[PDB]
Design a protein around this ligand. Structure first.
Ligand SMILES: C=C1CO[C@H]([C@@](NC(=O)[C@H](C(=O)O)c2ccc(O)cc2)(OC)C(=O)O)N=C1C(=O)O
Ligand SMILES: C=C1CO[C@H]([C@@](NC(=O)[C@H](C(=O)O)c2ccc(O)cc2)(OC)C(=O)O)N=C1C(=O)O
Ligand SMILES: C=C1CO[C@H]([C@@](NC(=O)[C@H](C(=O)O)c2ccc(O)cc2)(OC)C(=O)O)N=C1C(=O)O
Ligand SMILES: C=C1CO[C@H]([C@@](NC(=O)[C@H](C(=O)O)c2ccc(O)cc2)(OC)C(=O)O)N=C1C(=O)O
Ligand SMILES: [Zn+2]
Ligand SMILES: [Zn+2]
Ligand SMILES: [Zn+2]
Ligand SMILES: [Zn+2]
Ligand SMILES: [Zn+2]
Ligand SMILES: [Zn+2]
Ligand SMILES: [Zn+2]
Ligand SMILES: [Zn+2]
Lengths: 266, 266, 266, 266
C-alpha cells in the first residue's frame, strides 16, 4: 500500500543557521543573526528594536546576542519585519513570549504572520511557522520613532504582498549614516504572469524596483546578506563589497526580466 | 562549525497516513479518515458534519471520501474536534478554504487551533500546523443540532485543556445507537505532577475518566482507533472488539496511575 | 464633581435605518438594505452573495429580505465588502453566526473588520462594531466566481486603506449589464495633508479617482446611494438619475480638491 | 414609517466614571480607577502590573494615575483581568497601544476579549467594546511572578465563563498581606436554569462560591467595590467595612439561591 507522504520540514542551507557574534554596522546598529540571515538590533537610550529574526530556531541565539549587547528581554521594545516568511519572521511568536517586544507591521505582513505563513501565495503550506499577532499596523511612509531613532516604512510589494523596506539614520564618526534595510526582490519559482492569487504581481515588482532605487541609502542591508553583497563572516570587510540601493534594484530588475522571458518560453 | 539544527517535521507511523475507503458505523455515520486516524462524516438531510480531519496532508483524501458519500464541498456545514493537535485538526484550515465548513469548538480548543498548535503545553513548537479560526465557541454540555442529528459536547480536559467528547444518536435497524466519540486520555511524556503550565492536570484527568465512564455509549469511537480497540482495516469486524466507554475510561485511568508512579520514581 | 463622559453611540440619519423591500437592479441583483444604505444580494444557481450589510442593527432585516427572495441562511455563501466601517460591515459578525456565509476581503479590510472598526485612522474608537474574521484574503484584481457570476476586486484606497470596488456582469433583456459597486470616495473631517497615520492619503485618493473612472460600468451603485444619485425610495425610477462611474469619480475629485484647499486655509 | 432603532450606548452610573486619585491598599498595591470601578496597580522593582481597567473611557485617567505613582507607559508590563466585560476590560486595547503592557488571561477571557465582548452569553451585543488580543494564556492555578510579586489565578466561572480571582501577597508593617481580588459573582438578568448557551451555569456558580470561600484572603477586593463593601471615597476608612472572602461568597450564594427561586416562579 502507499500511504500519504510524511510532512516535510522547511530545511535551509547550513550557513543560514550558522550562529555569529554581533557585528556592528553603525553606532547603534548590529547584525545579531546568523552568517546568512540578517537580524538587526538597533540600540536606543529608550530600549531596543529588532528588524527580523531569521528562522524559528534562532530565538535563543538572538536572545544570547542581545544579552552580549547589553539588552535584556525587558529592553526589547519593538520587532519590525522585512516580510513574514519563515526564514525572516520565524522566531517572532517565541520572541514575543520571551521578551517585552511588540510587533509593528503592515496589514499584509500582519495577516500572513497571523496565519504563520500558511496558505502562502506561491509556497502553499510548505513554509508554515508559529503564528504571531501584530500589535500595531503601519501604513506606507509611516514612522516609528524609538529613542530618537526614526524608522520609516517603504512598501515594496512583490516577494510578498507585505514586503517592506525600513530606513533610519544612525551615526558613524559624528556623521549621519542613512541605513536602508531593503526587503527581498526575488520571485523564486513564482508564476509571474496571470497569477490568479496575485494578478498585479508584475506591476508591483516594477514599482518596488523604483522604490528601492530611490531609498535614502548610504548603506544597504538585505534579509539575505548575499543579495546586497554583504559577507557577514568577513569581519572588518563584511560590508566592503555591499551594493548601493540603485545597483540592488537594477540587478533584481534584470533578473526579473530574465525570469519573465523564461516563463513566457516555459 | 556547528549550525543550529534544521527544523524537524512531525512524522507519524505510516498506518496513520494510510488512506481507506468510507467505513459505515451507523445509518448516517462513516469513518472516512485513514487506517489509524479517525475522521467521522455524519450525513444529514440538512448537510454534513465532520468530526476530526486527522493529519494536515489528509485534506484531499477526506474530500475524495466525502464525494464518494454524496457530499460536495458546499454540503459540508460543520467541523467538530476531539482536540486541536496536528494529528486530529491538521487539515482544518485547508478544509475551511475548500468547503463551506465552519468550525465549532470550546475556548481552549479554539485558542490552540488559532495558534496552529504552537506553544503546546507539553510538546512546545514541535507539532505546529496551519492555524484556523473557530466560528462558534461551545460550552460544556452545549448541543449543536444539524438536520436532527443532535451533537452534545462533554468537556474532558487532560490530553489537552480543550479535549472534548462528542455524542449523538444515530440508528441501525430502526433502533437508536448512542455513539460516543471520546477524546484521547493519554498523557505521552507529559509532566503530570507540579506542572507549572498545567497545575490542575491530575484533577482534570481524574474528572475526565469519570466523564468518559458516564457517557451515553452504545458504541465508543476514539481519535486513535486502537485506543478503543477498533480495527478500521478489519471490514465487517472493524468494531467487533471495541471497548465500552467504561472499559476505555478504566484502562486509561490504570495507565495514568502507572505513569504517575513512574514519574514519582523518575 | 465631573465624571468622565458616558460612551456615545454611533447614531445615523433615520433614512439609513429605514427598512425597504427588495429592489431589483438586474436579473440576479437586488438592493435589500435600507432606503439610504446599500446591501446588494446577488442570486446564483450556486448560492447567494451579499455585498455589504449596512448598520449592525440591520441583520434581521437583511435575513427577512433574503427569505422573500428565496434565500435561506444556508444559501448565503459569500459576503463581500466595500469598506469595513460600521455603517457598511456593521452586521457581518451576526450574519456569519446566523448563516452559512464566509467573508472575503483584502488585508486592510480584514484587519479593520477583525478589530471591529476600533482604532480607526480618522474616527478613533467612535464607530466600533462587533468584530468578525475574514475567511479569504483577496488581492487587487482577484476574481471570485460564484455560480458563474464573476466578481472582480478593484482596490480604491482612501476612504479606508482597504476600500474596494466590486464589479460583475449581470443581465437585463438578454443583454449584459456591467455593474460597478464603487466604494465611498469621501473624506469626512479627515486630515488629508501630512497625516501621520496615513502619509500617502492624497496619492491614494488620486489613484482611486482614476480607478473608479476606468471601471466597467454600465450601472454604478455606491454604499450610500445618494453618492451615485440613486433614490431607492423612487421605485421604477430608483436608478434613473444614477451617475456614471466617470461622473462619480469627477465629482469626488472636485470635492476632494475643495477640501484640500479648505484644509490649507484652516 | 418606523426605522430600525438607533444603536444604544452602554451607559453606567456616574460614580463608575468618577475619577479618583490613587488609594493605597498595601505597600505595592493601589486602587487607581474610579470611585465605583476597581483598577489595581501593583508596583514592582521590575515593572508594574494592572488588574482591570474599568470602562473604555478610563484609559487616559489610568495613565494619569500611573504617572502620579511613578509609572510611565514603558513601565507597565502586565494587564490581568477579573472578567472581559466592558466595565472591567473596557480600555485594554487602548492601554496596549499606549503602553508596554501585555495581557495574560485564561482561554475564555481571551476569546471574549478578542471579540470585544460581542456575542455575550447573556447580554448579546449590547456591551461591545474595542477588542484586544491576549499575549499569554493562563491555566487554573498558574502563577505569574513579576518582580517577586507572585500572582495566582483561581478560575471562578459563572458571571462569565472566564471569570478569575487573582491572589498575591503584599506587605504592610513588615507583615504579609494576602490580597484576594475576587471576580463578580452576580448573575444580573441571567437565565440560570436550562440556559442553552451555558448548560452547566448553576454547577459553575456553586463551585465558584466554594473557590472564593477558600481563597487566601487577608484583604478582599472586587471589580465593583460595593460587592465587597469597599468605599473608595472614604479615605482612611475605605476598606474598614470590607467583607471577608467567606462573607462575600456566602452573600453571593444566598442571593443566587433567591434568584434561582424567583426564576422558577417567573
Ligand atoms: C531568495 C530566496 C530564496 O530562499 C528564500 C525562500 N525560499 C526558500 O527558502 C526555498 C526555495 O524557494 O527554494 C523553499 C524551500 C522549501 C519550501 O517549501 C519553499 C521554499 O524562503 C521561503 C523564498 O522566499 O523564496 N528566500 C529568499 C528571499 O529572497 O527572501
Ligand atoms: C497517544 C498518542 C500519541 O501520539 C499522538 C501525539 N504524539 C505523537 O504523535 C508523538 C509522541 O508523543 O511521541 C510526537 C511526535 C513528535 C512530536 O514533536 C510530539 C509528539 O500527537 C501529537 C500526542 O498527542 O501525544 N496522539 C496521541 C493521542 O492519544 O491523541
Ligand atoms: C459620506 C459619509 C459620511 O457618513 C459615513 C461615515 N461617517 C459618519 O457616519 C459620521 C460623520 O462622519 O459625521 C460619523 C458619526 C459619528 C462618528 O463617531 C464618526 C463619524 O461613517 C462612519 C464616514 O465613513 O465618514 N460614511 C460616509 C461614506 O462616504 O461612506
Ligand atoms: C453587578 C453587575 C451589574 O452591572 C455590571 C454589568 N451589567 C450592567 O452594567 C447593566 C445591567 O446588567 O443592567 C447592563 C446595561 C446595559 C447592557 O446592555 C447590559 C448590561 O456589566 C456589563 C454586568 O456584568 O452584569 N456588572 C456587574 C458585575 O457584577 O460585574
Ligand atoms: Zn521570502
Ligand atoms: Zn528569504
Ligand atoms: Zn494529541
Ligand atoms: Zn493523537
Ligand atoms: Zn466609511
Ligand atoms: Zn459610509
Ligand atoms: Zn460583568
Ligand atoms: Zn461589572
Amino acid at each position: 500500500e502507499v500511504p500519504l507522504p510524511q510532512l516535510r520540514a522547511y530545511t535551509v542551507d547550513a550557513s543560514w543557521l550558522q550562529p555569529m557574534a554581533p557585528l556592528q554596522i553603525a553606532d547603534h546598529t548590529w547584525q545579531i543573526g546568523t552568517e546568512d540571515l540578517t537580524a538587526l538590533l538597533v540600540q536606543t537610550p529608550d530600549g531596543a528594536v529588532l528588524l527580523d529574526g531569521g528562522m524559528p530556531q534562532m530565538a535563543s541565539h538572538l536572545l544570547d546576542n542581545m544579552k552580549a549587547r547589553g539588552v535584556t528581554p525587558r529592553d526589547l521594545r519593538l520587532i519590525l519585519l522585512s516580510h513574514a516568511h519563515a526564514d525572516h519572521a520565524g522566531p517572532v511568536a517565541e520572541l514575543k513570549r520571551r521578551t517585552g517586544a511588540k510587533v509593528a507591521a503592515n496589514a499584509e505582513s500582519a495577516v500572513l504572520l497571523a496565519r504563520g505563513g500558511s496558505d502562502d501565495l506561491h509556497f502553499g503550506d510548505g513554509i508554515t511557522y508559529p503564528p504571531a499577532n501584530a500589535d500595531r499596523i503601519v501604513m506606507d511612509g509611516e514612522v516609528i520613532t524609538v529613542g530618537g531613532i526614526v524608522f520609516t516604512a517603504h512598501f515594496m510589494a512583490g516577494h510578498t504582498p507585505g514586503s517592506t523596506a525600513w530606513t533610519w539614520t544612525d551615526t558613524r564618526n559624528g556623521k549621519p549614516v542613512r541605513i536602508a534595510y531593503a526587503d527581498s526582490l526575488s520571485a523564486p519559482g513564482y508564476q509571474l504572469q496571470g497569477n490568479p492569487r496575485y494578478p498585479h504581481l508584475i506591476e508591483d515588482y516594477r514599482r518596488s524596483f523604483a522604490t528601492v532605487r530611490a531609498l535614502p541609502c548610504d548603506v544597504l542591508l538585505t534579509p539575505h546578506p548575499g543579495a546586497s553583497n554583504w559577507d557577514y563572516a568577513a569581519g572588518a570587510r563584511a560590508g566592503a563589497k555591499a551594493l548601493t540601493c540603485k545597483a540592488y534594484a537594477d540587478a533584481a530588475e534584470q533578473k526579473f526580466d530574465g525570469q519573465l522571458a523564461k516563463e513566457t518560453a516555459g
